[PDB]
Structures are given as C-alpha cells and as structure tokens.
C-alpha cells in the first residue's frame, strides 16, 4: 500500500509537469514548422536531381573534389604587413569582433617580413587595391574530373573596407578549402561601407599545368551568406559571381538580385521572419573549427556556383558604426543542400492525473 505517497507525489508534481508540457508543446509547434520547411526543400531537391533540373547539377555535374586539405602549405606574394606573432598572441583571447577591430592595432603590430611558417595559418593586413597571390601545395585529397590536383593558386584583392584606413585584417588558413577570415572596424555611421574582396582560384594538375574548367563540372559552395537586421546593423553578405554561374539551392534564403547573390531579407532570426535561427550550437550557421557545417539546415543560408575559372567578389557590410565587420568566406566543393529531416515531430503527451 503506497496510495497516499503516490497520490501526494502526483499532486505535488503536477504544476511542474504542466509547465514542462507547455514548453514542450511550444517546441513541437516550432519544430513542425521547421520540419515542413526542410521537408519541402528536400523533396524539391530530390525532384531537381531526378528530373535533371538546373539545381540538380550539384549532384549530377560535380567533378570537383576540393573539401579537406589539412596538410597544405602556403607561399604568399604581395603582402607587406604581416601581423607579428606577439600581436596575434595579445589579441587571441579577445572576442572575435574585438580581434578584428582594426582600431586596436598599431603599426608596431605589423612587420614586412613574414614570421609565419608555410605550414600554419597566417595573419596579415590587406591594403585596398593591392592584389596578393597565395600558392597552396601539399594537396593530397583533391581532384577535378579525375585529374588529381597538385597545387592551388588563389589571388585576393581588397576593393574596399569598412574602416577609414583602406585596410582589413586577415587570417589566411593554410588549408585553401577554408579560404579567409577577414574583418575591420566599422568606422562610419550610415551602413553603407563594405569589405569587398575579389578572388580567383586556379587548380593545377600533377604536371603543373592549369586545369581547364570549361566542362562546367566545378560546382563550388557559397554558403553562410548571412543577412541579419538588428539595432546594431543591417548586415548583408553578398557574392558577385562575375562570369561564373549561379546554382540556386532549393529552399534557400539566397537568390540572384541583379548582379549579386544574397538573402534579400533577414535569414538569421525567426523573430525577424527567418525560417530557422542562425545563431547557437543548433543554428543553421553553426560551424566547426574545420569550417564544416554542423547543421542539416545549412542550405538555408547558402548558394552555389558553377565555377568557370573567372574572378568573383564577396562583400559584407551594413553594420552600425563601432561594431566591427567580419566574414569567414570559404568556398570549396561541399555545397550545402537540403537533407532528409527524418520523421515529422510528434506532439508531447499531455500530463494527466486521471
């Protein structure tokens, strides 16, 4: 006989069980909406692949494997201001936005002689209008149309900055599939300056010749094109593809607008109308240190291109004054597409005393 104890426990716990139910039910309603969006995008993508629609080229046309090059080493031409290792150390514990606050660095933090080994990530300031050329070798995992890739060259040119010094701070990864993390102070009010970088990638075969991409099999990612709108900015990340060709990702917030691809509306906060939240461990934009997306919903912030070997330009701007502008821009063969969301969420069981 435990009737009294059991009755009193069930009665005492009921308010908490009801509060947990309300939270679980709200979460279920939110999850159903996310599931329906993911399912629609996945079904559309499957149809595009099966029927041979344009976006099916992500699967059907891909001949480029260029996703992971953790052994690559760098040779850099055209950089005149490398960040000293002492200055890198001094800024390493700061918030990311402060690490890229160019107001917090002075001339004594930079040197003309590169202190970084070829095998490690390298830091430097870029100067508007000065093209740099980065050659990456020790390429072990990559190929294009069954031509193993021996080397990659990427040229980068800073066209504009958000600061008033014509400069931006860069962390250049030794693995070229991680590309570049760039930022600067946002020195002016008015949301109208931007960091703009033109890039061009050349792949080389085992005999050292440049690889012709005109079979149109190099499908490259343009993921993580955030657009957030808050009291602190109308921050938009964009790509001008130049002579390369846009590949629309089904269900993505990113589309073609004249000359550029980006998300026309906020894609970062459900509170601002986005379908998925971008922030946090569970957000669509979550990434590992390797740059790999953590989220099956990464497609929501992504575009892609058929890369034809010609220059393209990424931009980021719209922050308010004094909030440093940053972007981790990567491009590689790992296009973010909708994935199978699994089974539809089921509602929580309502707690009862009966």
CA dihedral 337, 338, 342, 345 (to 10 degrees): 140
Dmax over Cα atoms in the chain, in whole Å?
85
**In the complex, minimum distance from the CB of residue 237 to Ca ion, in angstroms, rounded to a whole number:** 5
**In the complex, minimum distance from the CB of residue 34 to Ca ion, in angstroms, rounded to a whole number:** 20
The answer to whether 172 and 81 are in contact (CB under 8 A) is no
- Using DSSP's 3-state secondary structure scheme, residue 276 falls into coil
- Using DSSP's 3-state secondary structure scheme, residue 328 falls into strand
Residue closer to Ca ion by CB (options 175, 285) is: 285
Residue closer to Ca ion by CB (options 142, 331) is: 331
Binding residues for Ca ion (CB under 5 A):
224, 226
Comparing C-alpha atoms, which of 334, 60, 315, 54 is closest to residue 220? 334
Q: Residue positions in the annotated binding site for Ca(2+)?
A: 224, 226, 237
- In this structure, the chain runs to a length of 354
Residue closer to Ca ion by CB (options 185, 224) is: 224
Query: Cα separation of 249 and 34, whole Å?
Result: 17
Residue closer to Ca ion by CB (options 79, 298) is: 298
**In the complex, minimum distance from the CB of residue 19 to Ca ion, in angstroms, rounded to a whole number:** 37
**DSSP category for residue 168:** E
Q: Residue positions in the annotated binding site?
A: 224, 226, 237
**In the complex, minimum distance from the CB of residue 175 to Ca ion, in angstroms, rounded to a whole number:** 18
Which residue's beta carbon is nearest to the bound Ca ion? Answer: 224
Query: Cα separation of 293 and 299, whole Å?
Result: 10
Residue closer to Ca ion by CB (options 201, 330) is: 330
Query: Cα separation of 191 and 168, whole Å?
Result: 17
Residue closer to Ca ion by CB (options 76, 323) is: 323
Instruction: Compute and round to an integer the Cα radius of gyration of the chain.
Output: 24
**In the complex, minimum distance from the CB of residue 224 to Ca ion, in angstroms, rounded to a whole number:** 3
Q: Is 238 left (phi over 0), alpha (psi -120 to 50) or beta?
A: beta
**In the complex, minimum distance from the CB of residue 168 to Ca ion, in angstroms, rounded to a whole number:** 15
């Amino acid at each position: 006989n435990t009737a009294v104890a059991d009755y009193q426990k069930a009665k005492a716990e009921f308010p908490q069980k009801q509060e947990q139910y309300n939270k679980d039910f709200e979460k279920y309603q939110s999850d159903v909406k996310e599931y329906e969006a993911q399912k629609a995008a996945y079904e559309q993508y499957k149809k595009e692949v099966a029927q041979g629609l344009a976006s099916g080229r992500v699967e059907k046309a891909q001949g480029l494997v260029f996703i992971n090059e953790p052994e690559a080493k760098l040779s850099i031409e055209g950089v005149n201001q490398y960040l000293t290792k002492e200055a890198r150390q001094k800024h390493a514990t700061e918030d990311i936005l402060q690490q890229y606050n160019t107001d917090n660095y002075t001339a004594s933090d930079f040197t003309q002689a590169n202190p970084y080994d070829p095998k490690e990530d390298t830091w430097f300031k870029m100067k508007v209008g000065d093209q740099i050329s980065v050659t990456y070798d020790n390429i072990v995992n990559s190929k294009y149309n069954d031509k193993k890739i021996s080397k990659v060259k990427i040229n980068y040119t800073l066209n504009s900055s958000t600061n008033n010094e014509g400069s931006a701070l860069v962390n250049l990864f030794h693995d070229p599939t991680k590309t570049i993390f760039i930022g600067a102070q946002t020195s002016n009010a008015g949301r109208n300056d931007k960091i703009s970088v033109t890039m061009q990638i050349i792949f080389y075969d085992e005999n050292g010749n440049e690889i012709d991409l005109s079979g149109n099999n190099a499908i490259m990612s343009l993921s993580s094109l955030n657009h957030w709108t808050t009291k602190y900015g109308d921050h938009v990340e964009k790509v001008n593809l130049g002579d390369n060709e846009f590949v629309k990702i089904p269900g993505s917030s990113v589309d073609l607008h004249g000359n550029e691809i980006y998300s026309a509306k906020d894609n970062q906060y459900k509170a601002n109308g986005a379908t998925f939240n971008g922030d946090g461990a569970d957000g669509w934009d979550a990434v590992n240190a390797d740059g790999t997306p953590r989220a099956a919903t990464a497609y929501y912030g992504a575009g892609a291109m058929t890369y034809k070997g010609e220059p393209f330009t990424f931009t980021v701007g719209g922050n308010d004054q004094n909030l440093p502008t940053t972007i981790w821009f990567a491009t590689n063969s790992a296009v973010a597409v909708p994935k199978d969301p699994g089974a539809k969420p089921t509602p929580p069981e309502k707690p009862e005393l009966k």
